[PDB]
Amino acid sequence: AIAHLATEYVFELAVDKMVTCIAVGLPLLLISLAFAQEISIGTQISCFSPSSFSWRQAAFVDSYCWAAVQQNLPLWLHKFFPYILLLFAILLYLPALFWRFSAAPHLCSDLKFIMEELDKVYNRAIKPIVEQYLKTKKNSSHLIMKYISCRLVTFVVILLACIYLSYYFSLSSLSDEFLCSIKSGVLKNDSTIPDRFQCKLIAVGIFQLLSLINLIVYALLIPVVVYTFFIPFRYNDLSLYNLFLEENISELKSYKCLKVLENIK
Amino acid sequence: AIAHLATEYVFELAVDKMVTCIAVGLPLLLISLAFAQEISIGTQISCFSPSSFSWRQAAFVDSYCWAAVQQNLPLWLHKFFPYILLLFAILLYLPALFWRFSAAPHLCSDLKFIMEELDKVYNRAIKPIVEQYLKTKKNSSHLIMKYISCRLVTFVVILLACIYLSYYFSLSSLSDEFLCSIKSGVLKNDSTIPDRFQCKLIAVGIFQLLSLINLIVYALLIPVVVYTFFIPFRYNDLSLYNLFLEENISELKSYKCLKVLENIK
Amino acid sequence: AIAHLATEYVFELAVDKMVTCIAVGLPLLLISLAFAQEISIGTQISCFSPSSFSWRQAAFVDSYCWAAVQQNLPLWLHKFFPYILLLFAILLYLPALFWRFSAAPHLCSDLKFIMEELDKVYNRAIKPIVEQYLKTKKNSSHLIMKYISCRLVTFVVILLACIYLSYYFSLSSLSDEFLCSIKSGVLKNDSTIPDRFQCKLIAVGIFQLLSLINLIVYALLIPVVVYTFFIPFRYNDLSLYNLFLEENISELKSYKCLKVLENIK
Amino acid sequence: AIAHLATEYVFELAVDKMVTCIAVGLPLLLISLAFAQEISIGTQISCFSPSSFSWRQAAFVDSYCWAAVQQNLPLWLHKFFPYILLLFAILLYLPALFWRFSAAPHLCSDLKFIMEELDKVYNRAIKPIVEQYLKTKKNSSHLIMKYISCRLVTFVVILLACIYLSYYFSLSSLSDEFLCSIKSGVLKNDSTIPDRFQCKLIAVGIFQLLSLINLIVYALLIPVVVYTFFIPFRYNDLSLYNLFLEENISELKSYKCLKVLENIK
Amino acid sequence: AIAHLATEYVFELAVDKMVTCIAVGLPLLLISLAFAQEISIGTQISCFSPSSFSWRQAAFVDSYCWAAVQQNLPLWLHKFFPYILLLFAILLYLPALFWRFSAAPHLCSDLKFIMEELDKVYNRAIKPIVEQYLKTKKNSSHLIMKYISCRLVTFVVILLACIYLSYYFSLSSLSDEFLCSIKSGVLKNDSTIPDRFQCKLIAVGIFQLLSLINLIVYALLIPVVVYTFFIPFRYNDLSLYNLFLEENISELKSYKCLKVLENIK
């Protein structure tokens, strides 16, 4: 049931995790809404098998035509549509996976050092190596390149998704039906068989609507991703550390005091 | 079995969690009651395939017509009805997700500071920075804007749901049946085929009743949500903190003593 | 298998938890016995499709008539019977959920204070604020209103269930069969189709027996619920706290000694 | 597979837990052996649909007759047989559930006090309130009434099971077949339909054997339950506490020494 | 897949646990190999329904004949064969369950006392109540009676299994086919129906081979069980305690030293 999907979701900067969780989670959700669960009914294609065709002859036409999709461009998309959404899902996850593997371990070690030293600064203020170290990160653009690349690849893939979905949704209405033919090889010569079988890719009607839903959300997601490039308003690694430091304020025992002190004073 | 649904539910202010758990949990429940489990029987559409149609020709009509729904407005709704309830479920969860990600971390850090300092006030009373800090939150409307927006979006979405469900329920009875036709493309010319196939969206009868159930609960849920706007009776951030402080009284070791002392004295 | 149901059950005052666990658990069990597992066999309706009808034409009649139930009152009940039992299950759980969310947190904080102070009284007896506090709860009717309302709503819903089940069981035997017709819209004019199809709601025979089982248990459950209103024999909040204190005697380290001392002395 | 059943079992006095685990576990096992797993094959009824009947007309007869069971006493039993075994299973569990909820909490608190004081007696013997308390339980028949009632209800239900199973097994062989008729309402007049359909409740052959198995085990279980009434050989509450004390000897650190000392001396 | 069976096994004296794990685990395995997984194909019986019989008439014959097995002895066995192996599995587990419930708690308490005192003897040897206690167990035959009975019942049941399996395997080849007839009651008179239907209990071919496998393993298991009776070579309870003490040498911290000391010295 759909609840077994929704509860699988209802029950690394925060906005970028949200962007990724949307960017990846939605198409995986939509695929699970599209090809799976009972709205899809029993089959993906069916065709006017003649009344003379046996139950398996008719099933042979339907299954042959499901291959014959690849032998026209919208039909090719309409068949592979779940995998194409999955491909976008994977391609949107990879920036976060690359971030996790290539950038997050350095940032983790740096932030943990920074936070502990800043708590020492507060302890000593009650009672500058870290500042010089931070002022050295001020003279660096290594980790921000990784971050920008992750945001930029996400932005590019989202645009490719929006382009693909806009094209797909616009073309879908014209082309959920096609004129298959089983007449090939030897049995091309079979006079008992119609020259072409009309077939409907029954799932295309679902994919059309859900492509629009995916397009709308990604069209909403583009400006949120674009906003990530406004880094100094949110271009040196220190600015990225500062943003992650502002994120990790939850851990700054000192800041929980010092911000209250500042806010009153 | 339905118990596998009900036990999935039977076994952030409290009222707002209740509102959200109702607002989101019910449609997910109703979808799982509607399209899933054996009350739905074997298929979503079926049609008068002529007695001359083969078992798969008849299945082709049923499956073609399940696409032909989209080629009339009630039929379009009747097909997508599970996803539309799911859409409302997601749109009702998002206020709480936004609250969790955008408001709850600030509030958590603030409340934990406030509660500890108030326990210190009690300890010192046995044996004003926090008050000045609270009196500073008295001069703020930042977090209450987030809260009001969450309540307001929930209210708006619930009204959109109530409007949609009222419309759907009112129209449903007229329009669970429709006159499909497979006659398209080449086989539009097939003289052996009826010009139109009468079809019934068999699930619509379930969706009709369950839309009314969802409407009634949301009609009950509207005033509970509206009551959330009566904040000073329950418009400055301090009032929101006060309400969350009154919520977190479970944690106020001092209050468990001080309220007994007050209540006796 | 039924063991996967029974073991899901075989493997907040106690009597009220028992009442709730019965009141909610039984219909969820009965639904899982009724519509689910192999006693239900393959389908919920079937009808005399003419011998001229195709396998899918016959399936179309059965599935159409499963919708046509709603187009007569017993048939409407007979279709929705699982959801109506589920509705009673939810409506019987809500008193306990309301109790858990609206009454139990106050009572928890109160009882934990009371129990600790009473252990101090025993410790001091070895070696009156709590009594004055309890004598203040003696002058209150706030929490007992919540309790009475929970018991009263449970009682009301159980009576509504007993009324519904008595009516349903009494009517069921007359009305598991009905005279469907697919003749509607265009194909109302189809001369090849019988004017009406006789159909049997095959599951009704199970629902009849299980409604009686549910009725009998709830008829047994009514006096147990009624007994809950005899509060001073078991009308001020202190009496409710006293009953919950008598419940929580398991926690009263002092009472485990003091009752032995009293019982000997 | 049957191993998924058997391993669910293969992988409160002990004898009474054994009795209950048998009394409840066996019918739940037998039901899972009876109506479930592949020995049951595909269907519960089938009937001589005429060769003129369609595949769904024939399925309509089978499913109609599965309802027509209730419209003769052995047929009524033969249909509901799984639920009747389940009913016995629940009715045999309830004594233990009642024991767990109504008697075990008092007994737990009493035994834990008794055992600790008896360890103190041993500690003081190395280096009488509990005896006077026990001699007070010697003047009581409260908890033994609960115990006797649990044993007596179990005994009664087991006898009712043995009576039912003996009757069912004895009658089963005569009555796994019956002469259904679909001829009712309008289509009572259908000349194309046989006046009666012969049907076999195919599962009855399994239920017959398994009823005998259940009967034999319960016939073995009766004397074990009867033995529970020989309390003073195993009628005052102290005797019940003594038996539970003899059970809990596993916890008596002193007895592990004192019994060795006694056994040598 | 078979791996989901094998990994359920691949991934109380040791030899007796091995014997029990074989004696019980193998038939449960074989049943899961026999009636379950795809080697069994789609059905347990099928019969020469005449070409005039409908698909459900033919299914009615097959399912009727699956009941008619019980209306000839090999057929009766061939149907119930899974439950008969399961019956042996349960009857082989019961000795170990009886051992666990009736003998192991005494033995556990005794061994734990014995082992601790023997470690004290070693500690005092570095720096006789237990010996007198053991020499008292030397004058006892209580627990060894329980053990012998467990081994003897296991031996008896294994022989009954070997007898049954030898008989079944020897007879199986003759009698996987039988001449059913549906001609009973009213439709005994149906001239359109053959006087008898030839049927094959298709699974019998699997049960034949697997009965031989079970027989061979149990024939191997008999002497291992018989070896258990050679107790003084492995008739007073001390000898049983000695064997369990030799088993629990893993726990004897002293023996890990003392045996090295002995082995060198």
Added chain:
Amino acid sequence: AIAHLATEYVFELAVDKMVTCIAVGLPLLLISLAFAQEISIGTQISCFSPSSFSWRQAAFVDSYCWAAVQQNLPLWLHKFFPYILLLFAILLYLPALFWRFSAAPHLCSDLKFIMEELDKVYNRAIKPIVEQYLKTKKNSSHLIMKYISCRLVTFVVILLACIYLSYYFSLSSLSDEFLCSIKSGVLKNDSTIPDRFQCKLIAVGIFQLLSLINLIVYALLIPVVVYTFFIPFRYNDLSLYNLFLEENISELKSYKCLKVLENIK
């Protein structure tokens, strides 16, 4: 999906655990690749039922012939092939199970003693009973007999597997088809039935390839097993302890120092 198989594996000396994990894991994998998952399609046998045979008559032939396999040697193998691979899997696991139960507990107790004493030797070297004990194990061949037997039985079973698989693979291509006949008993006389039905054991084509895969891996596994017999190059128990000591060097805190000291010095 195959990933649910592969991840079940992708996600006691080491080489012997590897050998066992291969020897047992591969056939269990191959069976799960062979008879299970969608490559196997819908059925194991099918046959030329005449066009006059009903759908169930044709299913009766297929299912009868699945039994008639046993009424020719390659057909007998081709049917039981999954169980024969499983039999090899179990027979290859038993050496490791026997090792775990019969040899590993002694070895565990010995190694743990040895390792602790060798750490004491290092501690005393910083600041010979174990050597004399080891020099006593030098005069023993008890545990190495168990080890050799485990390796030898594994080697024997692997050769029996390689022989069986080589034979099976070589014969498979000739004999995936056979000439069944249902003509037996009464209906041997049925003139409407062909004297023989040609059948194909459709799965044999998969078993052929996978038998070669199993053969190749086991042919690779033979020399690895043979290498295990080169014990003194890797015949007294000390040599086995030495090999297990070299294995457990991971635990030798001293060796982690002493080997560095040795390697530098």
Added chain:
Amino acid sequence: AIAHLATEYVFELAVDKMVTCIAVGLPLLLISLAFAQEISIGTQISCFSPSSFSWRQAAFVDSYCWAAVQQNLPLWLHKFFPYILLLFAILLYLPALFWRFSAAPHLCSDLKFIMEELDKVYNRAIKPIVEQYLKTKKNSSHLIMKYISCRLVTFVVILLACIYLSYYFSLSSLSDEFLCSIKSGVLKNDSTIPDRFQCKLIAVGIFQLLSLINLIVYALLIPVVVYTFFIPFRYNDLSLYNLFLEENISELKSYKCLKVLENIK
């Protein structure tokens, strides 16, 4: 649903773990995308059974031809394609498994020693055996041989995959159809049967696209694997330890300080 696949992945040097997780995870993913989930529809082959063939005769052709694939090279591949991808998956995992079992335990013990001694060097620097030991690893090529072999086998298998996939993808389009014949043995002579049946390996169209996807990723993966051979830019074991030391910098408490000190200074 595809989300149940993707979330199984979305939710030993790092680059080599990434390479392995890609190299192994992708084909397992693609197989689960290819042969499994609803895009594959109901069957792998179907064929032009004549209209005279029964539903099971037609199923017999389809299933016979699924065997007849092996009685032409592309057809043989097209059938076994899932197992061939799985074979590559296993063959790509084995380098990492061999690394885990044969190289990682030595490296683990070495690194843990090295890291602790380097922390001692820092502690002593606040307040050369390890250097001499490392300079001894400088004179070794044992572990780097294992590493190079793991990288080289991975590279070889990836090239074999790329070769296979390039060939398969290039040939696939020509050869998803083939001219089966059931005419063999006795029924070779059946005049009612066509001399050849045209069949389509319906899944080949999916395998074609997914082979290209696998090829593209592995073509991307080749240079990443090739880069692993540039060891001294990333040929003595010390260089491998240095790379693993640079990996384990996350553990070097000293380096977290010393690198900050170095970076500032």
